[PDB]
């Protein structure tokens, strides 16, 4: 229709996502999560890749102060899922060497941890590490949206034509 889950995406290629797509999904997903928080929609954890929806327009959404789910738990469940997607279907021996800025983003999201950075406390924090990946940080909104739009268009050519 207008969205593909990250789980359908991984099954269609039978390959992992690439590094740019990981940065993009974190940024886009965190922007949606931050907007949902403001609309006071309820926080929930990313239990699996099936909950991460990439849309035709490059949005990434998450399908079903202090409360029963902190921002950092949501962010940790996201960095774990993105780690899984970067590692999708690879033997232990053909394991993945991530560029240091990315490994470090994911570590700090997952709580699995200038060479060393600070702790992440919020969606904004994650989106700023993502921006910092670009030579011109003000390009991030358009850039990460463009990455996911491309990923959606590419993956629809396999989803529509099994």
Swiss-Prot record:
Q: Where is the KIND domain?
A: 4-158
What effect is documented for mutating residue 83 to K?
Answer: Abolishes interaction with FMN2
Q: What outcome follows a substitution of residue 80 to K?
A: Strongly reduces interaction with FMN2
Highest taxon of the source? Eukaryota
Q: Where in the cell is it found?
A: Cytoplasm, Cytoskeleton; Cytoplasm, Perinuclear region; Cell membrane; Cytoplasmic vesicle membrane
Which intervals of the chain are annotated as region Important for interaction with FMN2? 80-87
How is the quaternary structure described?
Answer: Interacts with FMN2. (Microbial infection) Interacts (via C-terminus) with vaccinia virus protein K7/OPG41; this interaction prevents innate immune signaling activation.
What is the purpose of this protein? Acts as an actin nucleation factor, remains associated with the slow-growing pointed end of the new filament. Involved in intracellular vesicle transport along actin fibers, providing a novel link between actin cytoskeleton dynamics and intracellular transport. Required for asymmetric spindle positioning and asymmetric cell division during meiosis. Required for normal formation of the cleavage furrow and for polar body extrusion during female germ cell meiosis.
Record comment regarding domains:
Binds to actin monomers via the WH2 domain. The Spir-box targets binding to intracellular membrane structures.
Similarity comment: Belongs to the spire family.
Q: Write the protein's name.
A: Protein spire homolog 1
Q: Which organism is it from?
A: Homo sapiens (Human)
